[PDB]
Amino acid sequence: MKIKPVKVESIENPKRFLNSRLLTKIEVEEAIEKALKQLYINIDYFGEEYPTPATFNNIYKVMDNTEWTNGFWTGCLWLAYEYNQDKKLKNIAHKNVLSFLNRINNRIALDHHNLGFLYTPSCTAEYRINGDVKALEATIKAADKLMERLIIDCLLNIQLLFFAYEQTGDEKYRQVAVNHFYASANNVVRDDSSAFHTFYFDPETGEPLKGVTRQGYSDESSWARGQAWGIYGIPLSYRKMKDYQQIILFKGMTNYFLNRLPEDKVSYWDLIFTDGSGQPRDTSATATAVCGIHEMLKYLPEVDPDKETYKYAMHTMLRSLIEQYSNNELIAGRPLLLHGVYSWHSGSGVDEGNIWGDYYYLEALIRFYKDWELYW
């Protein structure tokens, strides 16, 4: 019930954020409209099926409901639906929900996949929006699967458990979520506020763990998306826990991230790289961090000397995403956002759009545009 001390860096050169122009309503509206043009085109391309995790030379392939990423496509549909109230979006996304209910009922391809990622933006999303009982059923069933049961994205995985607690009143859901927050905070964040890797090898035999992918350049580096899972997963958990130490841990992880952004404020795939490295960007890490900062700002005290800096930072990052990284070719299978990195070491989705990146980009847009009720 205590978070270990971490180093909180000062935000260096804060004027690089504070001198930016805030994103206007017209700017965000047009960014949304441009995204939805691509989404409506992709709707006829995927049908009742789903994009692959990442694009191939910037075009998604079509697949069934068997990856770790399928929920993020349904999430794009719900976000768009909240923008325009088009029942077509609702109809298609509810079909996805039905598919997710089937998938959890039959335990199809669940591996060790983050269940929050699969069920929150798809099923919990619909329950937020219209109270659909099947979406609720699918969500609780996934929470129960997670209960039977350390990576930093577990910070988003446990939001499923907080939802289950709220819906059931069963404190066991909450007890697990809270324990898992502190286990994650103390064991997968370094004392310098960098995120760190999970277990790659069996703790008894040293055997390579099955279905575990090396992320980040090295044991000594700072994987950008991992850092971002912290930046967003911490305030999400803070909503449900209200431990002020969580705000300090957020400032540590976020300042660490901001201080390693390059000139256009869009993270390289690993934070050890910046301008001149020749390394690919990971826009998805940046979109995720914008969402996390936006969320934390709902709670951060007015007297926090960095609050205004954070506000300008997320605007600076989102503006760069909209202006330099968002997709401009309205072609079947194109993503919302270019230049992400899925898995550098395995050579997958390197400098490709990815579906979680598209999701968090649209979520950031919707967050800025409206008072958005969280799926998480």
From Swiss-Prot:
Outcome after substituting residue 346 to G: Affects preference for sulfated glycosaminoglycans compared to sulfated glycosaminoglycans
Superkingdom, natural source: Bacteria
Listed GO biological process terms: polysaccharide catabolic process
Up-regulation conditions: Constitutively expressed. Expression level increases in the presence of glycosaminoglycan.
Activity profile over pH: Optimum pH is 5.5.
Protein name: Unsaturated chondroitin disaccharide hydrolase
Keywords assigned: Carbohydrate metabolism, Glycosidase, Hydrolase, Polysaccharide degradation, Virulence
Top enzyme category: hydrolase
UniProt organism field: Streptococcus agalactiae serotype III (strain NEM316)
Note: Ser-343 and Ser-346 bind the sulfated group in the substrate and determine the preference for sulfated glycosaminoglycans compared to unsulfated glycosaminoglycans.
EC number, UniProt record: 3.2.1.180
Record bears the keyword Transport: no
Active site: 114, 153
Alphabetized InterPro entries for the sequence: 6-hairpin_glycosidase_sf, 6hp_glycosidase-like_sf, Glyco_hydro_88, UG_Glycosaminoglycan_Hydrolase
Assembly and oligomerization: Monomer.
Record-stated family: Belongs to the glycosyl hydrolase 88 family.
GO molecular function: chondroitin hydrolase activity; unsaturated chondroitin disaccharide hydrolase activity
Catalytic activity: beta-D-4-deoxy-Delta(4)-GlcpA-(1->3)-beta-D-GalpNAc6S + H2O = N-acetyl-beta-D-galactosamine 6-sulfate + 5-dehydro-4-deoxy-D-glucuronate
Chain residues that bind substrate: 114, 153, 211, 213, 225, 229, 343, 346
Temperature profile: Optimum temperature is 37 degrees Celsius.
Biological role stated in the UniProt entry: Catalyzes the hydrolysis of unsaturated hyaluronate and chondroitin disaccharides. Also degrades unsaturated heparin disaccharides. Releases 4-deoxy-4,5-didehydro D-glucuronic acid or 4-deoxy-4,5-didehydro L-iduronic acid from chondroitin disaccharides, hyaluronan disaccharides and heparin disaccharides and cleaves both glycosidic (1->3) and (1->4) bonds. Prefers sulfated glycosaminoglycans compared to unsulfated glycosaminoglycans. Probably required for mammalian cells invasion through the degradation of extracellular sulfated glycosaminoglycans such as chondroitin and hyaluronan.
Phenotype for residue 343 to H: Prefers unsulfated glycosaminoglycans compared to sulfated glycosaminoglycans
